[PDB]
């Protein structure tokens, strides 16, 4: 009663009903912060292989440091309209390249590690310092690490050390694979105690606190992360991440296959799809469409994406779901003339457009051909299927919990009739398709009729 | 005698007829595990500074592991139809998630770390326990990590266990760096003998089994694995390798050249190319089709490409090779009306389609401009040729080694005459174009002819 | 006095003047080299810790390099003509597979490692030789590492030779992890300092010198590297880096946006967009114009971009940003049917084409909606917003600094009138659209007139 699916054949589409919306309609930054070392030049008249080893420590955090320091910033699903994704965060950024901010975060950061600050622009950001260098680099080699009497015998020291050094190591290796720009962020950027922290110091509700305090594994992806300072004594890194201002709301995917009709001739075919597959979640009273698939994402039953590739679509849309054919709202489609094979993957089974004459087949592992199509939009289930083959591709199923419905009825490609088609549309829809075929029409017939 | 190229001037493009197939018709699932620990938290009252590190490690194991719980998861080119890539390996995943079988598994795993079993769903798969966590947390932390008695003065105790540790951290980093899903797989998912150990193991033929032995470099990028499960005191997550049912087919690649007129004119020009750029792989007795080269790969004469971006083709699409016009299949083919400069790089040259009036020019490294072509379709060899420039682009020539073929003949776009053509088509082909020019001329005439 | 926009309400669209032009018009390969080691197996009859530890390490490497050995390397925007990226350093890797290069290669860095020498194909190149193997592998280990007594109790021995071979380990994970052809190159394939080395001792302007000495963080996006050989005794793989022949040139970015009329009908609307959005340079007094803005990137005031996905076109095209009508150049533009809201992003601002009746909005963090639109292509700036919401979406604006214009006149869509307009053109443009809508008014006229 969670996830089900249900096919219609009056367009050949199909519809996963099952998961549950997760929407990033806001933003949230918070500035995290490495207290490093301004580190006088090592000095040792005299080399024990231990002292080596620290001195190279100290050096490749020195690289890393210069590192940092040149690096620090000095079908339908074509009319989204694209969006500044890295605005918050190096405006964050830009906020404390002020002079005065980094002393007061500084302060504000000098007993605890994670403190909610007021910016000098006045929108609110919560901080972090994770790893402090400054201890371990100041009161744990200096007063050890002395010009003449270098004894470092500890061999452990160089390893506690390093370990307190590969974090940053590696923050600075990404801020110089990544364009200082990375997604998603790395654990030594924040680690995941810390962003649970986070997630449960941070101004939203309960229930969405729960949701995502528990959902890391979706985030990063939906997370940035760009450099903001290395101004004074620290190391100071933005991370961005999502605010669900829009959540327990059920929402589904759409999935497309063309439509034709099956005549015995490969050639002079006639063809219709539903070009809009993708996504579709509910926040506002109105549908939130995603055009291309590869701006949403899914864990089990709650499907998590990002509405920049979104846009909203009256809820009438919907009923594009049962009668493409109403004038409430424009369906959108697109038509063509090829006639070839192939198969689109809905949430618990697959749809064959076995056309032309490629061998089509539905089997499950251990069965073999169990089912054998014949020249046309049919649809086959994951109940008792894991590999359906079109040509030489040999698609699985995913194999989630579900309940499949197949509605029967004839494909509206029934209703269009050759010699008169356009053989040439990809933006098109129900009513431009209307209008065209009229217009082809009455000038054939107003040509016929004037004799 | 190996691999030689073409260049076709009756339609401006090239083909690359050398490369052998290897296709990914089928896929293989193998369910790794690594024997995981549910360490009781460590007790040590009175710190040492190896004791530290000790305890600081299994901390970064139980952050890691911490980590693995809470991720735990339940132009022509437009038709192909997606597939579900991760269905078999989530599919093999959920199989485990019944209760049984991870008992099983273990058992069937306790001598060796390398043995084929049955699960539960069917389908015979084969899984190693390649990393033991159980050992060197239990017989050799354990026993002298006692709770005051915390004597480790040995100090490569932490060495030994980081160097076992590190791998199952970085695991446990691309699960949560990866959505759990990552592509390629890294070692520390499957060391490079394993990876060989598990192909020469696994139910392939001799021939295939030395094929895709030493054939690693590739298959990783044709490799998948999701986490499946943390059942009971192991860590198990699919991978999902690839089988290739086709071999030893010589296969090709197409690439493609706008056609034009040449009028002094910079504009009302008319421009037609090939739209079928890609790879075609022989397979069952029709070509396979992939039309995005992003689906492919290369790497010397064998190219090893995913079947997922292909359709199955007649064998009469060879034809479009030699005769455009040929009837036995509607070649695919694109117009428009935009007169600007480009060139295309095949396997073993590049073609300038020099138009409007850019000064193309091909030359070598050591001699510079050397050939100086004249609006329109022109190709040049890689033999005394590395340099190619169009405009302010600079290209360079791959300089394989082959044998380059030039057929002279006239252009199609001769017969198309101007102020009938349709300017505006991208899914068009022959027939469609023909169909079209006979309306237009039918209409104007008619037009005419009733007066 | 750097940076500014200026948005045209004529055809509704944003241009960002300020960027910096840096074009990689030429490139520059570079050979790497690192001195390996052909060891003799170990052999130690006997255990220690210290010395399974040494064994282990060894082992670690002698995976790497059987990895190594194993992966020995054996919308307008869509008629750019792709390129050979890889070329120029398998070119030279293959220049290197011939007999006797190696040992001039290897001889010439001997003493040094870094210099300039001329392989067989007659082109220089400079190489270095980072990481020296044999060294620590042959005078640090063998003397010390005999058959039976294999006094290794020095600890840090391990340690030295770790952090000496990571570098490596690193190198061929990446060679394995990236098909052996990766982008970016980690900073294991060339040391940020042999990075500033290297810049500072290849053949370029001292202005250029200078120029690509400081901007190591988006030069890694722009390079390239592929393994070349194993030889003998070394390891050496390419690296591709730019050569700015175009530099210190204004060069800005184009951005788009929809124009329609405003009926209240939500259907049967027409509209109109630029098609145009990318990045226009100037490099040899004519524009470079990048399509997608995939192939660019920012820094600042400074616009680093790859010229492989750019055209030359004419400077009467810059016009094209005033006069859309003009008959100097053709502009590009698109024409469809439906009516849906969206808005972009430009460098200092956003354009909301609030289409339909979606709620649309500009706002600030601490204000609020303090804009409200109707129905229409309007423009806002950055100053005090960074939050304009469409429908449900909610995106943010960069904050740099800039001065803002925005040019009033009356859109172009208010000439075009409907009932005659064709309802599909994506490569459409004034020029074409004219001939159409005149095509259209003789058909309807003649058909009239005969009466
Ligand atoms: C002769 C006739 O039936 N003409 C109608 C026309 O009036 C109408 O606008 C169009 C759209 O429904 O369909 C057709
Ligand atoms: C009836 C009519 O509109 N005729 C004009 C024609 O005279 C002109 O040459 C052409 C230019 O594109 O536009 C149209
Ligand atoms: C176009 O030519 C005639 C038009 O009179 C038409 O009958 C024919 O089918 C078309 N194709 C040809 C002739 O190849």
């Not at 961005?240 to 296959?257: A, F, N, R």
């Not at 990002?306 to 846009?311: F, K, Q, R, W």
């Amino acid at each position: 009663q969670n996830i089900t699916e249900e096919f219609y054949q009056s367009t050949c589409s199909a519809v996963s009903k099952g998961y549950l919306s997760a929407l990033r309609t806001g933003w949230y930054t918070s500035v995290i912060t490495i207290e490093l070392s301004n580190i006088k030049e090592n000095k040792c008249n005299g080399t024990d292989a231990k002292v080596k080893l620290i001195k190279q420590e100290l050096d490749k955090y020195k690289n890393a440091v210069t590192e940092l320091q040149l690096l620090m910033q000095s079908f339908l699903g074509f009319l989204l309209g694209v969006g500044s994704a890295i605005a918050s965060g190096v405006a964050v950024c830009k906020v404390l390249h002020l002079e005065g901010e980094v002393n007061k975060i500084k302060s504000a950061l000098l007993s605890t590690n994670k403190a909610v600050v007021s910016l000098s622009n006045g929108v609110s950001v919560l901080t972090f310092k994770v790893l402090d260098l400054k201890n371990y680099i100041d009161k744990q080699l200096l007063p050890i690490l002395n010009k003449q009497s270098c004894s470092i015998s500890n061999i452990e020291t160089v390893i506690e050390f390093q370990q307190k050094n590969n974090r940053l190591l590696e923050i600075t290796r990404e801020f110089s694979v990544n364009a200082g720009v990375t997604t998603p962020v790395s654990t030594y950027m924040l680690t995941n105690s810390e962003l649970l922290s986070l997630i449960n110091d941070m101004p939203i509700t309960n229930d969405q606190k729960k949701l995502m305090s528990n959902n890391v594994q979706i985030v990063r992806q939906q997370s940035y992360s760009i450099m903001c300072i290395i101004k004074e004594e620290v190391l100071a890194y933005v991370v961005q991440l999502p605010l669900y201002g829009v959540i327990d709301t059920p929402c589904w995917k759409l999935h497309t296959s063309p439509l034709c009709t099956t005549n015995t001739k490969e050639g002079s075919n006639i063809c219709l799809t539903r070009t809009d597959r993708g996504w579709y979640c509910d926040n506002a009273g109105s549908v939130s469409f995603f055009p291309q698939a590869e701006t949403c994402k899914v864990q089990s039953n709650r499907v998590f994406c990002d509405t920049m590739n979104s846009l909203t679509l009256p809820s009438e849309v919907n009923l594009c779901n049962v009668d493409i054919f109403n004038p409430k709202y424009d369906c959108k489609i697109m038509t063509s003339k090829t006639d070839v094979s192939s198969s689109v993957i809905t949430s618990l089974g697959a749809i064959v457009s076995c056309y032309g004459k490629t061998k089509c087949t539905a089997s499950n592992k251990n069965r073999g051909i169990i089912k054998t199509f014949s020249n046309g939009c049919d649809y086959v289930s994951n109940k008792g299927v894991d590999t359906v083959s079109v040509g030489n591709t040999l698609y699985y199923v995913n194999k989630q919990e579900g309940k499949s419905l197949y509605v029967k009825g004839e494909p509206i490609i029934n209703f269009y009739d050759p010699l008169v088609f356009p053989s040439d549309e990809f933006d098109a829809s129900i009513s431009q398709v209307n209008e065209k075929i009229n217009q082809s029409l009455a000038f054939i017939r107003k040509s016929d009729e004037l004799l």
